[PDB]
Symmetry: C2
Subunit: 191 residues, 2 copies
Amino acid sequence: QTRDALFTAATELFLEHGEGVPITQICAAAGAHPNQVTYYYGSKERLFVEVACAAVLRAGKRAEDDAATAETVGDYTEKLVGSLLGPGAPSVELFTSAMLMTGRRSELRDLITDTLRTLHSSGEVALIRTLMRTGWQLRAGIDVESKAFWSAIFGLVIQKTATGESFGYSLEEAVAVIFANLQIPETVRNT
Amino acid sequence: TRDALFTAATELFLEHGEGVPITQICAAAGAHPNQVTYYYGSKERLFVEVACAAVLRAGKRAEDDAATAETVGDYTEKLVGSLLGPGAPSVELFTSAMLMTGRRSELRDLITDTLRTLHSSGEVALIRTLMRTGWQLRAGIDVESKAFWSAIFGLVIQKTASLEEAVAVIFANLQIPETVRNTSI
């Protein structure tokens, strides 16, 4: 309720400006008292990590969702990768910032690790299954193929944002690296 | 003694990340806080400079560590083993530096120069590794170098919260056949 008001304001402000957004500005945005932050989240860092985790989960589902809408397979893949690298990029990028700032606070590491396992499960059952059932051959076990897909996504988002989408990491170029990683036969793509 | 600063900042950054206070760096190096504005202009520019140097140092260490490999797959294990092992802190710092550029040209230009170095050296190591084998990479050498580094940055960041898995990732993304992996170098 105020929980939700905080979460939304936090989400918008963090996605735009990163972890340095003062709490008072989130609270001003939410119509919340700074006390509700400590009540609902225990700390700013914990709000930030939860926001970052929900953002990337929601980004991954949006990509999978937008990909399910249509055949073809080449097109499912373009849609899925194009979503994560384009409109979902600030969410992936926040979650990368979150993974970097959680050294050893176990609270907080557990949110990260749970989020990572879910992204990786999600990739086995959406992308990698979409490929296998339409003809594509695993090069490694399905778990590893999901992780190869996700760590590419993380590294492409990071370098794309740092380079300002150039020096080899424009949107088109980053999409093409995922295509080269998957090397999906033309016949499979046309399904 | 820019270098006292650079040295102290590199150890403290590597260990604790960008939040290390600049006085703490100045106390480790016996410099005065003025010296940082002098030689670097900002703490962030010093941070970015240190992280850029650290990751280059890590890549050179990785190539050193892999230079005695006997086979392509041996080579890859040592290369990756090094970036995700001894070099992981330096890679993690450079990945932090990439996320904080804040659109500042002085900072982006350091990052992009450094990425270009890594990637060009990656193209060169890739082709030099595979020379003997008569096996040809599946996509363009430039695309392969990006796929290597994107994997590496994306893996190192996770470990932060398995080398066998990491090597298998590189193997898959590149589709290097088993017999190529076993081919001598």
